[PDB]
Amino acid sequence: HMCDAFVGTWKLVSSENFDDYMKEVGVGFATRKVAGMAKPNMIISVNGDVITIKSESTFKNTEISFILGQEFDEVTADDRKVKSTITLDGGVLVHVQKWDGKSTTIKRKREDDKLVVECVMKGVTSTRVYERA
Ligand SMILES: O=S(=O)(O)CCCSc1nn(-c2ccccc2)c(=S)s1
């Protein structure tokens, strides 16, 4: 009953500061423009200890499966090859990505009927809000 309140199908409904976040991460102009238009659907499921998070959009379809606390390799939508570790901290999924000596953290939390995604790179935060589909 690990992550129950995250499981389901979610649709992006608002974004703030995502272009600046992507700049900070190193995403180039054309990818930022196209990626910034996307309205992904996020599909989260759990089977035993394995959590799966899929993102489907006109830009890219991605999928990660993982066990909490256990590092895995991830190719991000912007084509970074990162080493990721996801843990639960007080009910928040905390996802750290490491690559080329850099780090970014993505937090996912349930707030009311929303799933709120906060992406941080150095001093720059983007907030992405999802509703149930
Ligand atoms: O906020 S969420 O889309 O849930 C997590 C965001 C973390 S990083 C990047 N996401 N994308 C991205 C992913 C899907 C669709 C459009 C853009 C980049 S391009 S870089």
Curated annotation (Swiss-Prot):
InterPro entries: Calycin, Fatty_acid-bd, ILBP, Lipocln_cytosolic_FA-bd_dom. PROSITE patterns: FABP. GO terms for cellular component: cytoplasm; cytosol; extracellular exosome; lipid droplet; nucleus. Pfam families: Lipocalin. Transmembrane segments: none annotated. The modification Phosphoserine is found at S14. The modification Phosphotyrosine is found at Y21. GO terms for biological process: brown fat cell differentiation; cellular response to lithium ion; cellular response to tumor necrosis factor; cholesterol homeostasis; fatty acid transport; long-chain fatty acid transport; negative regulation of DNA-templated transcription; positive regulation of cold-induced thermogenesis. SUPFAM superfamilies: Lipocalins. Keywords: Acetylation, Cytoplasm, Lipid-binding, Nucleus, Phosphoprotein, Transport. Changing E24D: In a breast cancer sample; somatic mutation. A motif (Nuclear localization signal) lies at residues 23-33. One of its GO terms (molecular function) is fatty acid binding. A fatty acid binds at R128, V129, Y130. It is found in: Cytoplasm; Nucleus. The modification N-acetylcysteine is found at C3. It comes from the Eukaryota. Belongs to the calycin superfamily. Fatty-acid binding protein (FABP) family. Monomer. Homodimer. Interacts with PPARG. Lipid transport protein in adipocytes. Binds both long chain fatty acids and retinoic acid. Delivers long-chain fatty acids and retinoic acid to their cognate receptors in the nucleus. Forms a beta-barrel structure that accommodates hydrophobic ligands in its interior. This is Fatty acid-binding protein, adipocyte. It comes from Homo sapiens. The gene is FABP4.
